[PDB]
Amino acid sequence: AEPKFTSFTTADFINDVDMELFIDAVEKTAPVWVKEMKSRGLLKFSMNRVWNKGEVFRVVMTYEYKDRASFEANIAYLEDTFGKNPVFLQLVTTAKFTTSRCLVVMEV
Amino acid sequence: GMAEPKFTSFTTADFINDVDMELFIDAVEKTAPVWVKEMKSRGLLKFSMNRVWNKGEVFRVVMTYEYKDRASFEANIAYLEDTFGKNPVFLQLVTTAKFTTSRCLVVMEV
Numbered sequence A: 001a002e003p004k005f006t007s008f009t010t011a012d013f014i015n016d017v018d019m020e021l022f023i024d025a026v027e028k029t030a031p032v033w034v035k036e037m038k039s040r041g042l043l044k045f046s047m048n049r050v051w052n053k054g055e056v057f058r059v060v061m062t063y064e065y066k067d068r069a070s071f072e073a074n075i076a077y078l079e080d081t082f083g084k085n086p087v088f089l090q091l092v093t094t095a096k097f098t099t100s101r102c103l104v105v106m107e108v
Numbered sequence B: 001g002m003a004e005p006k007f008t009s010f011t012t013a014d015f016i017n018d019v020d021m022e023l024f025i026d027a028v029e030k031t032a033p034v035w036v037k038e039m040k041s042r043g044l045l046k047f048s049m050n051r052v053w054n055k056g057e058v059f060r061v062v063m064t065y066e067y068k069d070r071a072s073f074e075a076n077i078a079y080l081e082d083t084f085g086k087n088p089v090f091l092q093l094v095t096t097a098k099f100t101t102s103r104c105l106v107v108m109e110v
């Protein structure tokens, strides 16, 4: 009946200082936003530092949801908490973010 | 995070049309009994293929390879270049697709 959903968000930063501020902020606050996202059916999150694209400061973040309802619930949470929050938005003002939303086709 | 971090690669595969993309998904699914066993024996923890639906009119999957560590990643690249590189065949399939890979270290996971 129910496909799984996974999102890949690539965050690109001007320099190391900016990326390190983001990473530290994400890690430090995880105890709150992870609890909330898991209560809504996030299965797993990961942050991944890109190493094969030269001198860039780039992470890929992965969000693995149980199903559509979890995906939708977690989008609403992230909008409310971060996307619509001008103080957070200012924290990453010169960063570029781009997300690919996916249906899981095959996993082994 | 870890002294010996996990490694993860994300390959994005783009196709000209739906036919070409499903021919690829099917190929990857059908040959899995060979390659999955081989990669896991070299430290692949997990593989996934993911259809991207939010980029409008594109035909595109993201493939994720989750490795135990740097050595496992390296053994797996070795295996793949040995195998699919020097068994083409595979080369002709991937010939109309465009592939781009982002290779990473895991900073945090939960």
Ligand SMILES: CCCCCCC(=O)CCCCCCCCC(=O)O
Pocket (backbone or CB within 6 Å): A007, A009, A025, A026, A027, A029, A033, A063, A074, A075, A078, A082, A088, A099, A101
């Ligand atoms: C204080 C800020 C640190 C906390 C940030 C937590 C976090 O998960 C980053 C928000 C990025 C939003 C983009 C993700 C898109 C989600 C999706 O499409 O599934």
Ligand SMILES: CCCCCCC(=O)CCCCCCCCC(=O)O
Pocket (backbone or CB within 6 Å): B008, B009, B011, B027, B028, B031, B035, B065, B080, B084, B090, B093, B094, B099, B101, B103
């Ligand atoms: C065309 C079918 C033959 C077998 C293909 C097996 C498969 O897993 C797809 C390989 C696509 C190339 C991606 C290799 C990247 C691995 C990495 O960087 O970690």
